């Protein structure tokens, strides 16, 4: 039931499964490729407060994995470390063979706690989490991934940075996030913020020196009138 795309040249058609189509050619298996695409390429929102609303927990359903040979570069990748309130892990350790997605402009690393009702975290729209050369139905702990889909087509004849967040209520609808600048220094995270904005704020804070230099923590709140980027 899996469709294949056929590229005649620049022209792409979905293969007709029932028709013979003597026109179509396949000379070797090297013309058959599994390519992964990111959901960000379809314009889905990528900020942390919105991306987590597409993920959730379920029990009683095992994970599945497929491979892909090529894929695109992601502007926004995610990496989760979520614990239950009592310290138990929410996400399973990745099995060997799983490695993080190879090319990300930014990695949004979110650590924190929250209720985790299920056995695994699954994508709610049915998308796959993309790992090194593997697409998975579930999220594995500590490993960088991108959200995406796999196409299956027949062919014609690095510096990156990390943005850290800390959160509570990870698995629920009403949650809170802070952007980490230093161990004691935080910024309230808004849904209107872009990766570029947060990085500019990180430079502003270290440069001005307005960081916590005591034993407690500081949280900066953004003035709603200053725009972002």
């Amino acid at each position, epitope marked *: 039931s899996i469709p294949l795309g056929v590229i005649h040249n620049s022209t792409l058609q979905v293969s007709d499964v029932d028709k013979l189509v003597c026109r179509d050619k396949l000379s070797s298996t090297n013309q058959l490729r599994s390519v992964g695409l990111n959901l960000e390429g379809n314009g889905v929102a990528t900020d942390v407060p919105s991306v987590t609303k597409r993920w959730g927990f379920r029990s009683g359903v095992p994970p599945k994995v497929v491979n892909y040979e090529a894929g695109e570069w992601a502007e926004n990748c995610y990496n989760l470390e979520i614990k239950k309130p009592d310290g138990s892990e929410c996400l399973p350790a990745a099995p060997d063979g799983i490695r993080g997605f190879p090319r990300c402009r930014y990695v949004h690393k979110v650590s924190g706690t929250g*209720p985790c009702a299920g056995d695994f975290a699954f994508h709610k729209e049915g998308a796959f989490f993309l790992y090194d050369r593997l697409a998975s139905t579930v999220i594995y702990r500590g490993t960088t991934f991108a959200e995406g889909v796999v196409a299956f087509l027949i062919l014609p004849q690095y510096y990156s940075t990390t943005i850290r967040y800390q959160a*509570t*209520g990870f698995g629920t609808n009403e949650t809170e996030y802070l952007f980490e600048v230093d161990n004691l220094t935080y910024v309230q995270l808004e849904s209107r913020f872009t990766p570029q904005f947060l990085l500019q704020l990180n430079e502003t804070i270290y440069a001005s020196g307005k960081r916590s230099n005591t034993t*407690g923590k500081l*949280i*900066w709140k953004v*003035n709603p009138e200053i725009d972002t980027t």
Partner: antibody
Amino acid sequence: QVQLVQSGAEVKKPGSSVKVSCKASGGTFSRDIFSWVRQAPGQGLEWMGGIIPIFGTANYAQKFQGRVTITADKSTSTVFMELSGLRSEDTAVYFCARGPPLRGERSWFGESEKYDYFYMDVWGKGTTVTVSS
Amino acid sequence: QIVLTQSPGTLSLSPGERATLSCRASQSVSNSYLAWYQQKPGQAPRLLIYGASSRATGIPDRFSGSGSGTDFTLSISRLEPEDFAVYYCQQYGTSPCTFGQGTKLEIK
């Protein structure tokens, strides 16, 4: 007006631990700072340790490091404390308390708010814990 | 560590008489961040004053106080029968929060 509701009196045997709950009600966890204190009869009231749920972190007075664990769970609006290594010397009324963040520095970005354990405005009724056998 | 000492151990005063309570630190309290609380037997202490001079919410105007550096004072203009409590000073200007031993007001 915010209130703190604590569990009732308990009796533990020497060598065990006591878990005391404190429910936040009349408000929500928000960004408030919670702490626990201890007052043995005839003694003043000492800070044991505390938690700030929004970071999900806690710390302790040096005399209780390794003995006290403080946790919280947003979904039940509850702060919990556990005191281990119990001996009869530990008999005391244990209290939970809550206080505000203080306003900090201001810049063009926006305003800062400071989080540490300061003064307590809201107090629970106290849980009496006795250690004996 | 800022160590706080309060005095007198017990102030013996008639009802309606002015109460003066002293707290003295071994070290200055940053930002004059010292608080006072009123404790009754069987009850958690109620915050009366914080930040040396800021009156706490719901506290009667008969309660006052001031201070800076190491020297802080709480006073009650007329001590009512209901106010013959154990009073404590606490400092939060420097971590950890520390506190005095407490003093009592008693009826003469």
